[PDB]
Amino acid sequence: HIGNYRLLKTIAKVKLARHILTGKEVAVRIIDKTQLNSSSLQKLFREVRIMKVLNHPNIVKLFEVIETEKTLYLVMEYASGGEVFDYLVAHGRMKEKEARAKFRQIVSAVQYCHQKFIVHRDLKAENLLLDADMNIKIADFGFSNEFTFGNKLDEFCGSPPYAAPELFQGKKYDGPEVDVWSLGVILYTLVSGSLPFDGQNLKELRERVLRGKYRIPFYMSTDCENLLKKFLILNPSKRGTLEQIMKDRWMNVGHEDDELKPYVEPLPDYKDPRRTELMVSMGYTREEIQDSLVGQRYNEVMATYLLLGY
Amino acid sequence: EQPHIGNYRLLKTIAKVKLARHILTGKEVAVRIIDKTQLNSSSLQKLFREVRIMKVLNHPNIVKLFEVIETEKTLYLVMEYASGGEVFDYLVAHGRMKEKEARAKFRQIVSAVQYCHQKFIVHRDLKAENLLLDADMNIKIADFGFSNEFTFGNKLDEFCGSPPYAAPELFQGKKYDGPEVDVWSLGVILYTLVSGSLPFDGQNLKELRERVLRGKYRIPFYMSTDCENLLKKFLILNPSKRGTLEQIMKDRWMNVGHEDDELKPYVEPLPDYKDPRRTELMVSMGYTREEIQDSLVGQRYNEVMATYLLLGY
């Protein structure tokens, strides 16, 4: 094993693991640096930094970073509930009351990143993970657990049906309004268990996408069809921001007093007495806990700390 | 090992697809199972249009249709099973193919697609996940007619592996219609056979598009020169300047170690419908002589014809 972790089984090389001293499960991406060229190494560590800066409850967290001469271990949040894509396959559509619960979390998460000028650019159901409580954990925001670095044969499973029309018109695919279209598509698959735009191949899928028409089922409320109209607009400049969309009726149904808003980064969690104590009586010194959590080292000490929060 | 349908025992699922065993010959097949009640008149005609295409392709390297079983509510299509799996899964497991091995599969691949081009049928979706392998490592292209991946606009199709093989047209809003599209896809396929990786990559569709539209790809140090020149005839950004497969069959690399046996378009062999050997086995199965005669002469795609074909393996 590596660090305070016991590799259990595997699930791009990713391992399920048990933090020995907390018994908490964790995902452990393993990456071989010798097999990387400078251009790719840079992009990696650049994305590792992005992961260290996104502190949101629906964006899979990073717990530790172990880096050796030839290897880089990335210990991150494991989501025991799997993909949103797999769920939707089994249980079919969600109930209007169920989707809203998660679609709030999603839009809050994506919105948070747009604040920092990070657009995800590949939003899909396969990238929305769930934990043991049915809470949303978006993945691949920074570093991607699905994309190898040019070596392998990526299949881009699930990416096309959520692509905005710009992609097929040769127009730029850069701005936040791109995640915005995809959110539309996402929402639609949640309340229907199906695709607004579909086809036998990429040709047919394109045809349907660029036309922008999509069937609304009978069982879909009228407040819902009205939320889709705000996402699936063909012209990128007329698609509204996410701050403007959190103020929708369908979004806030059941939250008459609890209206959705641009998430506010919570203050640095680093001094919790309960965990500082629990740690000391494991064999951690007081100030190494202090230095580790002050400097946000993301080492074996910071990892243990964060893992005690579950 | 429980349900039966016609002469088939359904063994397991592999869209709804079952690997089954034909009880009279013990041969394996794949049965696509379609719920007709879940389809609308428009779609029903697309189904039978495509099935008519399936009955009409007769190439050694395209998956063959054996039988159509139709009931009130359901349609069963019985087709070749490729036990060797996807070329994709095979590249992932074994790395690249050395050039000699690649030429062998690429030859079969070109014959098959060119065959469909002669009839003005274009695949529109060649990828390494569509190139199946049989027990002898022979290529069987899937999805030329009906698609064992495309569930009719109903579910949550994933399109696995499609993007990296799309001609630049797709991302430019231009017509994605002609054979040239397949030709570009062939270019990608060749390259991934011999290097075990894609010529155009990227962490998301946006990044993929840049590489595709630009049209630049690295030639590995180990790639033969003849190979590099062959890629140059497929991976041309302008649709109209891409060659036809008939011309591309004449290429040097295509024919290494095939000097007197140059790749030329496939000619459809004479019909099979009289083999007295197989005719006799069938007679002692309960089939009558003229019922064998009618179905084979008529190319019916009923249980008789299917039993006859499968006795050919």
Q: Is B174 left (phi over 0), alpha (psi -120 to 50) or beta?
A: beta
Please judge whether B205 and A173 are an interchain contact, meaning their C-beta atoms are less than 8 angstroms apart: yes
Residues from chain B that touch A199, judged by Cβ atoms under 8 A, are: 150, 153, 157
**Residue B159 C-alpha, separation from nearest chain A C-alpha, in angstroms:** 6
Please judge whether A202 and B160 are an interchain contact, meaning their C-beta atoms are less than 8 angstroms apart: no
Please judge whether A200 and B155 are an interchain contact, meaning their C-beta atoms are less than 8 angstroms apart: no
B47 Cβ under 8 Å from any chain A Cβ: no
Q: Residue holding tokens 């045809």? A: A207
Inter-residue contact A301 to A289 (CB < 8 Å): yes
Exposed e or buried b for every residue in A167-188, given b needs 16+ CB within 10 A?
bbbeeebebbbbbbbbbbbbbb
Q: Residue holding tokens 């036998």? A: A200
B173 Cβ under 8 Å from any chain A Cβ: yes
Kindly list the distances between the CA atom of residue A173 and the CA atoms of A58, A166, B210, in Å, as whole numbers in the listed order.
Answer: 24, 6, 10
Q: Residue holding tokens 């197989």? A: B278
CATH superfamily entry for domain B1-81: Phosphorylase Kinase; domain 1 (3.30.200.20)
Kindly list the distances between the CA atom of residue B38 and the CA atoms of A221, B121, B158, in Å, as whole numbers in the listed order.
Answer: 24, 27, 20
Please work out, in degrees rounded to the nearest 5, the angle formed at the alpha carbon of residue B147 by the alpha carbons of B135 and B102: 40
Catalytic residue among B35, B89, B125, B143: B125
Structure tokens at B224: 């033969």
Rg (CA), chain B: 21
Q: Which helix (H) or strand (E) holds A114?
A: helix A96-115
CATH topology of domain B272-313: Helicase, Ruva Protein; domain 3 (1.10.8)
Q: Does domain A79-268 have CATH number 1.10.510.10?
A: yes
- Quick one: closest CA in A to B208, which residue? A156
Residues A202, A205, A207, A208, Cα dihedral to 10°: 180
- Quick one: closest CA in A to B212, which residue? A170
Structure tokens at B173: 């809003």
Inter-residue contact A15 to A8 (CB < 8 Å): yes
Experimental approach: X-ray
- Quick one: closest CA in B to A197, which residue? B153
Domain coordinates of chain B in residue numbers? 1-81, 82-271, 272-313
Q: Return the DSSP state at A281.
A: T
Please judge whether A206 and B91 are an interchain contact, meaning their C-beta atoms are less than 8 angstroms apart: no
Exposed e or buried b for every residue in A12-29, given b needs 16+ CB within 10 A?
eebbbbbbebbebbbbbb
B40 Cβ under 8 Å from any chain A Cβ: no
Architecture of domain A269-310: Orthogonal Bundle (1.10)
Q: Return the DSSP state at B164.
A: G
Please judge whether B161 and A156 are an interchain contact, meaning their C-beta atoms are less than 8 angstroms apart: yes
Q: How far is CA B288 from the centre of its chain?
A: 34
Distance CA B221, CA B206 (A): 28
Residue B216 burial (C-beta neighbours within 10 Å; 0-12, 13-18, 19+): exposed
Q: Return the DSSP state at A262.
A: -
Three-state SS across A126-151?
A: HHEEECCCCCEEECCCCCCCCCCCCC
Length of chain A: 310
Closest CA relative to residue A141, chosen from A74, A48, A42: A48
Architecture of domain A1-78: 2-Layer Sandwich (3.30)
Residues from chain A that touch B213, judged by Cβ atoms under 8 A, are: 170
Q: What does A156-175 look like in DSSP terms, one character per residue? A: -TT-GGG--THHHHT----S
Structure tokens at A40: 């790719």
Distance CA B247, CA B256 (A): 16
**Phi then psi dihedrals of residue B213, to 5 deg:** -65, -40
Please work out, in degrees rounded to the nearest 5, the angle formed at the alpha carbon of residue B70 by the alpha carbons of B67 and B76: 55
Residues from chain A that touch B163, judged by Cβ atoms under 8 A, are: 156, 159-160, 202
Contact residues for A229 (Cβ-Cβ < 8 A; gap 6+): none
Residues A297, A300, A301, A307, Cα dihedral to 10°: 110
Residues from chain A that touch B150, judged by Cβ atoms under 8 A, are: 199-201
Strand partners, B4: B9
B170 Cβ under 8 Å from any chain A Cβ: yes
- Top-tier CATH class for B82-271: mainly alpha
Exposed e or buried b for every residue in B4-14, given b needs 16+ CB within 10 A?
ebbbbebeeee
Amino acid at A56: H
Distance CA A58, CA A281 (A): 31
Residues from chain A that touch B176, judged by Cβ atoms under 8 A, are: 202-203, 206
Distance CA B220, CA B236 (A): 19
**Phi then psi dihedrals of residue A63, to 5 deg:** -110, -35
Q: Return the DSSP state at B64.
A: P
Give the orientation angle of helix A177-190 with respect to helix A96-115, to 10 degrees: 170
Length of chain B: 313
- Quick one: closest CA in B to A92, which residue? B155
Distance CA B287, CA B276 (A): 13
